[PDB]
Amino acid sequence: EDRNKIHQYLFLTSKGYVKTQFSWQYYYYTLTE
């Protein structure tokens, strides 16, 4: 549940489904198809 909470907050950093942009310290995350 400790990861289910964030994975349902969404709608892991390396497996996929994640684009990481830094842009002054704010770790811009987005999902992929």
Partner RNA sequence: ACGGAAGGGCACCACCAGGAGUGGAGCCUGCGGCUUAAUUUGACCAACACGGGGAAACUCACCAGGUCCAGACACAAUAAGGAUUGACAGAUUGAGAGCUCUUUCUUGAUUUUGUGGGUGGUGGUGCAUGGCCGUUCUUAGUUGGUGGAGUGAUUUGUCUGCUUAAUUGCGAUAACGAACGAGACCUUAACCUACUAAAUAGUGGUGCUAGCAUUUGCUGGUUAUCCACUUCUUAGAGGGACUAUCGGUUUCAAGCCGAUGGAAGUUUGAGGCAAUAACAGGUCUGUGAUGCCCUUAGACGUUCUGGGCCGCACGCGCGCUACACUGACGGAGCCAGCGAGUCUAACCUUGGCCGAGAGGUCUUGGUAAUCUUGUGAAACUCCGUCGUGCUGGGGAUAGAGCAUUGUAAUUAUUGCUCUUCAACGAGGAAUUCCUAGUAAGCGCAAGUCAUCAGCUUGCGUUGAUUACGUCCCUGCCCUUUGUACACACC
By CB under 8 A, name the binding residues for another protein: 21-26, 28, 30-31
For the residues of 1-33, what is the DSSP string, one character each?
-TTHHHHHHH--TTTSS-EEE-TTT--EEE---
Under rule CB under 7 A, which residues in 1-33 are in contact with RNA? Answer: 2-3, 13-15, 20, 22
CB 10 → RNA: shortest distance, Å? 16
Looking at the Cβ atoms of 14 and 25, the one nearer to another protein is 25
Which of another protein, RNA, none has residue 15 at its interface (CB below 5 to 8 Å by kind)? RNA
Degrees to nearest 5, angle at CA 13 with 12 and 18: 90
